[PDB]
DNA sequence: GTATGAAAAAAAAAATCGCATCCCGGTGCCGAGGCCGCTCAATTGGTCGTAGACAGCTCTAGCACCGCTTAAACGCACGTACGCGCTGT
């Protein structure tokens, strides 16, 4: 067969997804998740199909936004793989925990 | 001279209600003072928006509450929501 | 248990967009956990806006107002 | 219109109304709404100007969100302004940190 | 009901800057939000500027000072101008 | 050139208080540069408050209002 | 003779300064610096003796605040010495630069 | 532990080969542009009241002087761990 070396793909995958703006999480699973968490605070709740997307948007862009910083952490450690402790470090400095 | 108001006198009464046998420094007092004004302004602000969002011109005890829920962490808000509600109910009945 | 509905590869993507080449198998769970925290914190407020308005339905606006409050403001849903 | 007296597009009127009904102060110095309306117009433009250049560089007539993002983020100044700001279907500026690249 | 916008003003300005370039509903809505924010940011800083100095009247002066603080250097300068220009031109047009 | 007036050891201290154990000789300059940036950004506004008030003296309040604006709020000078 | 081993002091120095609240920069040099920067925006400026301190406070607490994060960066790199690139990384993630 | 050969295997360069992205048509159809009818909000012009302009008096509170002792800064240099680079599951 013919097989590209580990990473080379990812690298392509990045170029692709960087370039596009589409939402990368599957709409329903998310929509459902949103509702599952909704119930915790009040029951018999409805959501504007726009509100759903609205959330999804900020989440992805945030998660992306984190991973950006996350990677910069992993890099600073002479690494290339991101590890929980990278996110943790980022979130700390960000001020999302202590 | 000018007439720069404060909260410094209220702080004292509250201090004595909680730790009668403990004093406080000008510097710490001034701090406490600033602390109040901030939260005041934070709440007032969130409330003013709460009003402006819902096409209202009247900020009521209800608006304050909702603001508090948003601004304060869980346990802190709860204990406050209470000591609020308690202070409202008690005044509307004391005429 | 819809948290898992956030699929390993769906995260892969997000991270790829961040500029990530390689990803510990531990991350995926970590990420989920974070996302939960985020939405929760947000929605809580978002709802709490709704609770004030005397609506049982949550509007986009409620979402925004909350996102703004949480210092992650969003353009493209008005306000 | 007042809008024409300044020579602006933006509705110096609707601003003035928005300000009195806004709970921003008691009284609003008829000058203010002009100054503001302009500022907004300018910012609006400065962006559109840039967005329009990105659109052309994509071979599109119509500005989409992505343009706005790309435009804002590549200008140092606009960026700083919209620091704690998210843009719908904005994507991200193609950047891959060199140590990731191969060989 | 009547959901207001700025969408119409944007268009006029677009054509003044790039006549032969359009825009998307989604981007328009964005631009819309962008305006309201800065508006509110400025108004806000101005309201405080007033309240700090024991005034009840926000003038063209207050707006300016706000802008100086909120906008970065070069952006503020270009704006301070297009402002001042818009004031002067109205006080002379009666 | 008062920037150097911020003495190598005076920084040592600050960093020590942060919980710093060891310090590259490069840091000291780096730190100075940062400090400049900080004060500048702040004072700029702080002054600009003063400039508005028609005062040639800068008040504590002007300082605070600026610090508040710059999202590094300060208690103890009467905000 | 008698010498404490490199670090052991620093460690003490920390305990000490952590515990105390006094200002760690010398008042005048700072006061002077404040004025030197004041001139850049307008000349013949006077400062409330309180305003000066007010600044000094936020600066130190900020610089401390940075160094805290800074160190966490150096640490994440299995190191103990802080290097400019640590601050830089921190400030990036913080959002003080790009 | 130095100059020949030599040599053997990781590192520099081509030719298979293939697989994946861009460009150019070329297919459909939606949601962007401009007409329409309808309300409100923008405009105009009077009425009033009060914020802010102006000039002035009162006294605080920054700038500047001094000359002393003192702890902080400055430096130098001697030696330890601390970081930096290599190597192998």
XYZ file of C-alpha atoms (C1' of nucleotides) in Angstrom:
735
model
C 0.000 0.000 0.000
C 0.915 3.758 0.428
C 0.791 5.304 3.975
C 1.697 8.893 5.111
C 4.000 9.210 8.220
C 2.370 9.934 11.634
C 1.593 13.696 11.916
C 1.776 14.541 8.163
C -2.045 13.888 8.054
C -2.927 15.889 11.231
C -0.897 18.757 9.572
C -3.186 18.489 6.470
C -6.271 18.069 8.759
C -5.240 21.431 10.412
C -4.799 23.389 7.099
C -8.327 22.108 6.170
C -10.134 22.966 9.483
C -8.174 26.238 10.081
C -9.388 27.353 6.569
C -13.103 26.390 7.150
C -15.588 27.928 9.707
C -18.206 25.077 9.952
C -19.081 23.740 13.465
C -16.960 20.614 14.286
C -19.250 19.064 17.028
C -22.330 17.069 15.889
C -25.456 19.318 16.373
C -27.875 16.816 18.060
C -25.519 15.221 20.660
C -24.724 18.860 21.701
C -28.396 20.052 21.528
C -29.300 16.999 23.713
C -26.336 17.693 26.117
C -27.456 21.356 26.465
C -30.977 20.106 27.489
C -29.532 17.385 29.882
C -27.679 20.231 31.745
C -30.758 22.546 31.396
C -32.858 20.053 33.476
C -30.377 20.296 36.447
C -31.460 23.989 37.046
C -35.138 23.826 35.860
C -37.380 21.213 34.083
C -39.911 21.612 31.163
C -37.471 24.055 29.412
C -37.503 24.929 25.672
C -34.557 26.493 23.713
C -34.599 28.708 20.566
C -32.904 26.572 17.798
C -30.708 29.776 17.440
C -29.772 29.812 21.196
C -28.483 26.182 20.788
C -26.133 27.118 17.878
C -25.227 30.378 19.715
C -23.847 28.213 22.593
C -22.176 25.624 20.269
C -20.349 28.598 18.584
C -18.788 30.078 21.793
C -17.911 26.539 23.127
C -15.938 25.413 20.020
C -14.217 28.869 19.597
C -13.400 28.719 23.379
C -12.137 25.077 23.221
C -10.111 25.982 20.068
C -8.989 29.195 21.930
C -7.849 27.001 24.901
C -6.089 24.356 22.697
C -4.195 27.253 20.977
C -2.813 28.308 24.453
C -2.682 24.615 25.611
C -0.326 23.741 22.699
C 1.889 26.810 23.457
C 2.308 25.240 26.956
C 3.207 21.715 25.652
C 5.641 23.429 23.183
C 7.292 25.456 26.020
C 8.014 21.986 27.582
C 9.984 21.050 24.339
C 7.037 18.643 23.594
C 4.566 18.332 20.631
C 1.767 16.176 22.280
C -0.690 18.133 24.544
C -1.208 16.532 28.043
C -3.875 17.314 30.689
C -1.230 19.306 32.725
C -0.916 21.726 29.705
C -4.666 22.581 29.708
C -4.566 22.707 33.553
C -1.544 25.172 33.408
C -3.311 27.320 30.721
C -6.662 27.410 32.695
C -4.716 28.315 35.914
C -2.904 31.305 34.258
C -6.208 32.205 32.439
C -7.915 32.190 35.896
C -10.575 29.476 35.284
C -9.392 27.679 38.507
C -6.416 28.081 41.005
C -14.595 70.864 54.934
C -16.039 68.961 51.878
C -18.417 66.282 53.413
C -16.989 62.994 51.962
C -19.533 60.369 53.238
C -18.487 56.759 54.136
C -19.751 53.352 55.349
C -17.044 53.314 58.097
C -19.632 53.759 60.968
C -21.885 50.829 59.784
C -18.843 48.482 59.440
C -18.093 49.126 63.206
C -21.677 48.178 64.394
C -21.450 44.956 62.220
C -17.878 44.171 63.514
C -19.191 44.342 67.138
C -22.239 42.134 66.177
C -19.778 39.409 64.915
C -16.552 39.956 66.973
C -17.287 42.510 69.762
C -13.680 42.231 71.136
C -11.839 42.990 67.804
C -10.912 46.464 66.325
C -9.736 47.534 62.790
C -7.142 49.811 60.969
C -7.807 52.990 58.874
C -6.159 51.139 55.917
C -8.390 47.996 56.325
C -11.482 50.244 56.923
C -10.780 52.191 53.684
C -10.434 48.732 52.003
C -13.812 47.492 53.385
C -15.228 50.911 52.219
C -13.986 50.320 48.582
C -15.209 46.664 48.739
C -18.802 47.892 49.413
C -18.873 50.598 46.638
C -17.565 48.014 44.029
C -20.184 45.288 44.740
C -22.871 48.007 45.131
C -21.845 49.323 41.644
C -21.505 45.748 40.205
C -25.049 44.868 41.437
C -26.622 48.281 40.528
C -24.974 47.834 37.066
C -26.170 44.224 36.456
C -29.637 45.389 37.742
C -29.683 48.527 35.444
C -28.955 46.136 32.502
C -31.534 43.542 33.772
C -34.066 46.465 33.625
C -32.874 47.836 30.203
C -32.904 44.236 28.699
C -36.631 43.681 29.617
C -37.933 47.195 28.527
C -38.549 48.201 32.226
C -37.858 51.666 33.818
C -38.346 50.380 37.456
C -35.653 48.309 39.323
C -37.458 46.285 42.098
C -36.265 43.832 44.840
C -36.814 41.078 42.164
C -34.197 42.619 39.756
C -31.629 42.914 42.648
C -32.098 39.175 43.485
C -31.586 37.956 39.857
C -28.482 40.240 39.643
C -27.115 38.688 42.925
C -27.701 35.108 41.576
C -25.502 36.021 38.540
C -22.770 38.061 40.368
C -22.294 35.909 43.524
C -21.098 32.259 43.660
C -23.683 29.550 44.639
C -23.456 29.202 48.492
C -22.690 32.962 48.942
C -25.678 34.019 46.726
C -28.062 31.544 48.518
C -27.150 32.895 52.061
C -27.570 36.459 50.597
C -30.780 35.797 48.542
C -32.137 34.702 51.982
C -30.836 37.619 54.193
C -32.275 39.827 51.388
C -35.754 38.162 51.045
C -35.874 38.082 54.922
C -35.155 41.884 55.056
C -37.839 42.607 52.338
C -40.693 40.436 53.848
C -39.974 41.894 57.371
C -40.313 45.559 56.133
C -43.468 45.104 53.917
C -45.152 43.642 57.106
C -43.755 46.340 59.528
C -45.744 48.943 57.432
C -24.849 10.648 29.861
C -24.669 12.743 26.612
C -21.200 14.157 27.632
C -19.676 11.181 25.645
C -21.774 12.432 22.634
C -18.764 14.810 22.338
C -16.822 12.259 20.223
C -13.015 11.655 20.483
C -12.489 12.771 16.825
C -14.841 15.836 17.197
C -12.328 17.084 19.826
C -9.384 16.013 17.559
C -10.882 18.558 15.082
C -11.185 21.456 17.628
C -7.552 20.849 18.776
C -6.441 20.598 15.111
C -8.042 24.098 14.605
C -6.056 25.269 17.706
C -2.877 24.196 15.833
C -2.340 20.810 17.625
C -0.287 17.942 15.993
C -0.441 15.246 18.758
C -2.892 14.563 21.612
C -2.697 12.335 24.779
C -5.598 9.796 25.046
C -6.224 11.308 28.539
C -7.048 14.767 26.961
C -10.430 13.704 25.487
C -11.942 13.088 28.990
C -10.160 16.189 30.457
C -11.708 18.291 27.571
C -15.261 16.866 28.146
C -14.962 17.764 31.870
C -13.860 21.324 30.963
C -16.636 21.756 28.375
C -19.250 20.605 30.981
C -17.882 23.215 33.504
C -18.035 25.947 30.785
C -21.627 25.260 29.509
C -22.897 24.730 33.118
C -21.422 28.070 34.394
C -22.791 29.803 31.240
C -26.238 28.110 30.916
C -26.826 28.573 34.703
C -26.716 32.401 34.184
C -28.385 32.138 30.696
C -31.313 30.251 32.309
C -31.236 32.707 35.289
C -31.834 35.513 32.705
C -34.812 33.438 31.366
C -36.067 32.802 34.978
C -36.186 36.654 35.422
C -38.170 37.277 32.157
C -41.008 34.856 33.251
C -40.333 32.672 30.146
C -40.102 28.800 30.251
C -38.328 28.995 26.819
C -34.661 30.239 26.654
C -33.917 32.838 23.865
C -30.614 33.409 21.971
C -30.503 36.872 23.711
C -30.492 35.166 27.169
C -27.473 33.100 25.883
C -25.611 36.279 24.681
C -26.330 38.403 27.821
C -24.756 35.485 29.811
C -21.748 35.034 27.420
C -21.179 38.850 27.692
C -21.423 38.553 31.555
C -18.923 35.604 31.476
C -16.385 37.771 29.515
C -16.614 35.672 26.282
C -18.948 38.111 24.400
C -20.556 36.877 21.128
C -21.404 38.842 17.940
C -23.739 37.265 15.295
C -26.851 36.644 17.492
C -27.676 40.371 17.982
C -27.787 42.434 21.228
C -32.236 65.557 9.040
C -29.491 66.233 11.680
C -27.629 63.233 10.051
C -27.243 65.352 6.820
C -26.179 68.523 8.812
C -23.042 66.624 10.024
C -22.852 64.896 6.567
C -22.867 61.425 8.272
C -24.840 58.309 7.178
C -25.492 57.113 10.795
C -28.727 58.411 12.398
C -27.502 61.116 14.882
C -31.199 61.250 15.965
C -31.725 57.542 16.910
C -28.428 57.743 18.924
C -29.710 60.867 20.842
C -33.006 59.000 21.636
C -31.058 55.757 22.518
C -28.910 57.822 24.974
C -31.807 59.519 26.919
C -33.725 56.148 27.132
C -30.436 54.269 27.877
C -29.941 55.257 31.574
C -26.426 56.688 30.787
C -27.120 60.044 32.556
C -29.902 62.650 33.243
C -29.017 65.069 30.339
C -27.312 64.500 26.897
C -25.340 67.402 25.263
C -26.902 67.577 21.716
C -23.232 67.643 20.500
C -22.526 64.124 21.922
C -24.850 62.081 19.623
C -23.152 63.664 16.524
C -19.564 62.889 17.736
C -20.549 59.291 18.674
C -22.597 58.586 15.464
C -19.465 59.610 13.479
C -17.069 57.449 15.630
C -19.356 54.421 15.038
C -19.634 55.214 11.266
C -15.771 55.414 11.108
C -15.166 52.118 13.008
C -17.953 50.508 10.877
C -16.093 51.766 7.756
C -12.479 51.030 8.903
C -13.706 47.376 9.252
C -15.875 47.178 6.070
C -12.925 48.801 4.149
C -10.676 45.910 5.412
C -13.376 43.156 5.116
C -14.082 44.302 1.507
C -10.322 43.797 0.739
C -10.418 40.207 2.206
C -13.634 39.425 0.227
C -11.904 40.529 -3.058
C -8.804 38.424 -2.063
C -11.166 35.343 -1.773
C -12.863 36.177 -5.158
C -16.230 37.002 -3.462
C -18.527 40.050 -3.951
C -20.334 39.397 -0.594
C -18.538 39.800 2.829
C -19.185 36.750 5.117
C -18.318 36.562 8.848
C -14.877 34.847 8.208
C -13.766 38.015 6.288
C -14.629 40.288 9.291
C -12.637 37.921 11.606
C -9.653 37.659 9.171
C -9.721 41.505 8.632
C -10.027 42.435 12.377
C -7.438 39.855 13.572
C -4.694 40.874 11.019
C -5.003 44.596 12.021
C -3.121 44.838 15.399
C -5.423 47.746 16.548
C -8.946 46.315 15.805
C -7.735 42.978 17.332
C -6.855 44.550 20.751
C -10.296 46.307 20.697
C -12.199 43.014 20.114
C -9.980 41.010 22.542
C -12.731 39.413 24.714
C -15.017 39.078 21.620
C -16.188 35.996 19.634
C -17.398 36.171 15.948
C -20.013 33.679 14.535
C -18.484 31.211 11.957
C -15.205 33.161 12.456
C -12.730 30.236 12.182
C -9.071 31.188 13.042
C -6.083 32.814 11.209
C -4.049 29.981 9.592
C -1.024 29.752 11.992
C 0.937 26.476 12.705
C 3.925 27.020 15.102
C 7.140 26.168 13.167
C 8.481 23.389 15.551
C 5.349 21.356 14.492
C 6.393 21.506 10.742
C 8.322 18.420 9.545
C 11.819 17.325 8.244
C -43.650 44.591 16.205
C -40.667 46.735 14.940
C -37.198 45.135 15.611
C -34.892 48.153 14.824
C -31.360 47.780 13.311
C -28.361 49.705 11.879
C -28.326 47.325 8.828
C -29.483 50.163 6.436
C -26.660 52.611 7.502
C -23.959 49.887 7.094
C -25.069 49.493 3.397
C -24.792 53.282 2.564
C -21.284 53.305 4.222
C -20.245 50.025 2.403
C -21.068 51.685 -0.979
C -19.157 54.885 0.097
C -16.003 52.705 0.736
C -16.397 49.659 -1.622
C -19.365 50.321 -3.982
C -18.852 46.960 -5.824
C -18.836 44.673 -2.687
C -21.848 43.057 -0.843
C -22.306 41.489 2.671
C -24.078 38.430 4.325
C -27.069 38.476 6.771
C -24.760 36.678 9.299
C -21.905 39.260 8.889
C -24.497 42.137 8.934
C -25.959 40.844 12.252
C -22.308 40.706 13.485
C -21.561 44.331 12.379
C -24.931 45.248 14.075
C -23.764 43.728 17.449
C -20.287 45.350 17.000
C -21.915 48.850 16.853
C -24.209 48.368 19.940
C -21.171 47.102 22.031
C -18.826 50.060 21.268
C -21.814 52.454 21.540
C -22.513 50.930 25.032
C -18.744 50.863 25.942
C -18.423 54.600 25.034
C -21.821 55.663 26.519
C -20.769 53.737 29.690
C -17.258 55.277 30.002
C -18.944 58.695 29.265
C -21.737 58.158 31.910
C -18.938 57.428 34.459
C -16.765 60.377 33.169
C -19.858 62.572 33.935
C -20.689 60.915 37.334
C -16.956 61.171 38.421
C -16.890 65.014 37.893
C -20.353 65.757 39.518
C -21.937 66.595 36.087
C -25.476 65.543 34.924
C -24.739 66.633 31.260
C -22.677 64.439 28.820
C -21.248 66.751 26.041
C -19.205 66.116 22.821
C -16.084 66.678 25.058
C -16.952 63.702 27.376
C -17.513 61.385 24.332
C -14.051 62.328 22.917
C -12.134 61.664 26.208
C -14.010 58.305 26.501
C -12.982 57.405 22.871
C -9.287 58.338 23.582
C -9.334 55.800 26.479
C -11.380 52.986 24.778
C -9.787 53.076 21.266
C -6.085 52.346 20.508
C -3.840 55.320 19.458
C -4.052 55.491 15.596
C -7.735 54.309 15.604
C -8.721 56.963 18.238
C -6.815 59.760 16.325
C -8.662 58.962 12.977
C -11.936 58.899 15.059
C -11.220 62.005 17.244
C -10.908 63.710 13.800
C -14.039 62.235 12.039
C -15.815 63.216 15.307
C -14.488 66.847 15.634
C -15.203 67.192 11.834
C -18.858 66.024 12.398
C -19.307 68.467 15.386
C -17.797 71.616 13.670
C -19.876 70.860 10.476
C -23.218 70.753 12.480
C -22.575 73.902 14.675
C -21.987 75.796 11.319
C -25.013 74.188 9.484
C -27.321 75.813 12.157
C 16.465 56.875 32.661
C 14.788 56.191 36.085
C 13.753 52.706 34.780
C 17.172 51.360 36.040
C 16.288 52.953 39.468
C 14.281 49.686 39.760
C 17.298 47.790 41.167
C 18.214 44.144 40.289
C 17.721 43.030 43.954
C 14.424 45.029 44.360
C 13.024 42.775 41.573
C 14.669 39.698 43.177
C 12.451 40.548 46.213
C 9.147 40.895 44.243
C 9.821 37.558 42.452
C 10.832 35.947 45.789
C 7.396 37.049 47.171
C 5.778 35.432 44.061
C 7.463 32.150 45.092
C 10.496 32.286 42.716
C 13.598 30.163 43.642
C 16.077 31.081 40.815
C 16.184 33.933 38.241
C 17.964 34.343 34.820
C 20.173 37.510 34.647
C 18.175 38.367 31.472
C 14.909 38.630 33.587
C 15.825 41.938 35.284
C 15.793 43.893 31.944
C 12.739 41.911 30.661
C 10.892 42.833 33.956
C 11.811 46.584 33.671
C 10.415 46.577 30.076
C 7.175 44.950 31.329
C 6.844 47.332 34.309
C 7.255 50.340 31.931
C 4.459 48.915 29.652
C 2.176 48.403 32.732
C 2.626 51.874 34.372
C 2.513 53.615 30.922
C -0.799 51.885 29.900
C -2.215 52.714 33.379
C -0.846 56.251 33.944
C -1.769 57.208 30.317
C -5.486 56.662 31.163
C -5.016 57.917 34.807
C -3.583 61.197 33.461
C -6.274 61.232 30.677
C -8.883 61.204 33.520
C -6.990 64.193 35.081
C -6.769 65.945 31.627
C -10.627 65.715 31.458
C -11.201 67.146 35.018
C -9.203 70.373 34.191
C -6.729 69.577 37.045
C -2.882 69.844 36.636
C -2.579 67.622 39.788
C -3.366 63.846 39.474
C -5.574 62.428 42.318
C -5.510 58.890 43.790
C -9.111 58.536 42.427
C -7.861 59.171 38.824
C -5.306 56.321 39.486
C -8.053 53.910 40.754
C -10.613 54.732 37.968
C -7.802 53.796 35.497
C -6.746 50.606 37.394
C -10.493 49.627 37.479
C -10.733 50.354 33.676
C -7.570 48.226 33.061
C -9.193 45.240 34.914
C -6.680 45.342 37.834
C -9.087 47.081 40.311
C -7.667 48.424 43.628
C -9.159 48.595 47.163
C -7.634 50.899 49.834
C -7.732 54.305 48.032
C -11.530 54.711 48.157
C -12.967 53.420 44.829
C 34.278 29.355 57.153
C 30.443 28.775 56.848
C 28.197 29.074 53.701
C 24.493 28.043 53.214
C 23.960 25.989 49.971
C 22.666 27.828 46.847
C 18.832 28.112 46.994
C 18.446 27.475 50.769
C 18.645 31.326 51.194
C 16.164 32.211 48.373
C 13.804 29.664 50.100
C 14.161 31.653 53.386
C 13.940 34.986 51.445
C 10.529 33.739 50.080
C 9.064 32.655 53.484
C 10.084 36.164 54.766
C 8.634 38.276 51.874
C 5.542 36.066 51.337
C 4.739 36.638 55.084
C 5.252 40.472 55.003
C 3.153 43.134 53.135
C 5.665 46.098 53.049
C 6.414 47.590 49.574
C 9.582 45.975 48.046
C 10.491 48.798 45.532
C 12.187 51.944 46.960
C 9.561 54.793 47.147
C 11.578 57.679 45.543
C 13.097 55.855 42.511
C 9.460 54.748 41.778
C 7.908 58.218 42.520
C 10.592 59.682 40.133
C 9.873 56.937 37.489
C 6.105 57.671 37.729
C 6.873 61.391 36.973
C 9.341 60.471 34.087
C 6.396 58.555 32.452
C 3.919 61.351 33.488
C 5.894 63.874 31.320
C 5.350 61.690 28.152
C 1.545 62.512 28.259
C 1.666 66.059 29.810
C 4.331 68.304 31.515
C 4.146 70.399 34.775
C 2.105 67.589 36.480
C 1.754 67.129 40.298
C 0.729 63.818 42.038
C -1.261 63.111 45.269
C 1.277 61.385 47.659
C -1.545 58.727 47.903
C -1.841 58.304 44.066
C 1.931 57.427 43.994
C 1.549 54.626 46.619
C -1.737 53.561 44.943
C 0.249 52.890 41.709
C 3.250 51.246 43.523
C 0.720 48.835 45.167
C -0.926 47.560 41.915
C 2.532 47.291 40.203
C 4.178 45.098 42.894
C 1.023 42.902 43.369
C 0.843 42.601 39.517
C 4.600 41.820 39.144
C 4.302 39.292 42.041
C 1.076 38.011 40.324
C 3.056 37.588 37.032
C 6.121 35.910 38.683
C 3.685 33.436 40.383
C 2.392 32.392 36.870
C 5.906 32.878 35.337
C 7.405 30.335 37.771
C 4.535 27.843 37.096
C 5.673 28.029 33.423
C 9.421 27.441 34.201
C 8.295 24.554 36.522
C 6.108 22.991 33.758
C 9.399 22.849 31.732
C 10.934 20.666 34.595
C 13.075 23.793 35.428
C 13.466 25.952 38.623
C 15.104 29.152 37.117
C 12.648 31.619 35.403
C 13.729 32.759 31.859
C 12.250 35.633 29.797
C 10.421 33.024 27.559
C 8.434 31.964 30.729
C 7.111 35.532 31.328
C 6.539 35.888 27.536
C 4.512 32.559 27.504
C 2.537 33.636 30.654
C 1.759 37.156 29.218
C 0.648 35.526 25.886
C -1.804 33.106 27.647
C -2.868 35.996 30.004
C -3.544 38.153 26.884
C -1.084 41.038 27.558
C 0.494 40.389 24.077
C 0.026 37.919 21.115
C 47.554 7.606 21.841
C 49.106 10.030 15.667
C 48.584 9.753 9.756
C 46.784 5.640 6.078
C 42.260 2.626 4.372
C 38.512 1.283 4.917
C 34.498 0.609 5.868
C 30.166 0.424 7.160
C 26.078 2.512 8.298
C 23.115 7.068 9.514
C 22.529 11.514 6.551
C 22.241 14.223 1.468
C 19.920 13.404 -3.757
C 17.293 11.155 -7.242
C 13.609 8.245 -9.634
C 8.980 5.469 -8.870
C 3.762 6.251 -7.778
C 0.083 7.819 -5.813
C -2.832 10.441 -3.349
C -4.689 14.666 -2.112
C -5.490 20.061 -3.012
C -6.573 23.944 -6.754
C -8.606 25.762 -10.845
C -12.111 25.809 -14.570
C -15.795 25.128 -16.111
C -20.605 23.992 -15.596
C -25.699 22.867 -12.443
C -29.176 24.699 -9.168
C -31.324 27.431 -6.161
C -31.448 30.372 -2.306
C -31.197 34.582 0.327
C -29.196 39.388 -1.226
C -30.879 43.608 -3.402
C -34.625 46.920 -4.464
C -39.959 48.098 -4.701
C -44.186 48.612 -1.461
C -47.475 50.484 2.614
C -47.492 52.132 7.389
C -45.604 53.598 12.095
C -43.267 55.155 14.603
C -39.518 58.261 15.744
C -37.055 62.094 13.797
C -37.853 67.498 13.027
C -39.485 71.681 14.510
C -40.478 75.020 17.390
C -41.697 77.074 21.681
C -41.350 76.998 27.698
C -38.970 76.331 31.511
C -35.463 75.164 34.715
C -31.223 74.132 36.031
C -26.592 72.369 34.842
C -21.965 74.599 34.020
C -19.493 78.849 33.117
C -16.833 82.567 35.503
C -14.408 84.814 38.601
C -13.129 84.785 43.099
C -11.271 83.343 48.309
C -9.570 79.804 51.366
C -6.063 76.556 52.963
C -3.911 71.538 51.364
C -1.025 69.731 50.008
C 2.794 69.115 46.118
C 7.966 71.014 45.233
C 12.479 72.062 47.451
C 15.768 72.858 51.208
C 18.958 70.601 54.365
C 22.862 67.353 56.393
C 22.971 63.398 59.237
C 23.182 58.160 59.872
C 21.822 53.984 57.878
C 20.326 50.117 55.377
C 20.073 49.164 50.299
C 23.105 48.852 45.940
C 27.046 47.828 43.833
C 30.374 44.613 42.750
C 33.702 40.601 42.694
C 34.944 36.330 42.835
C 35.021 31.398 44.407
C 32.335 26.832 43.755
C 27.294 24.244 43.514
C 23.844 22.691 41.876
C 20.934 23.796 37.680
C 19.988 23.632 33.153
C 21.367 21.932 28.292
C 22.468 18.270 25.108
C 23.025 13.436 23.952
C 21.484 8.659 23.986
C 18.329 4.529 24.333
C 13.694 1.865 25.915
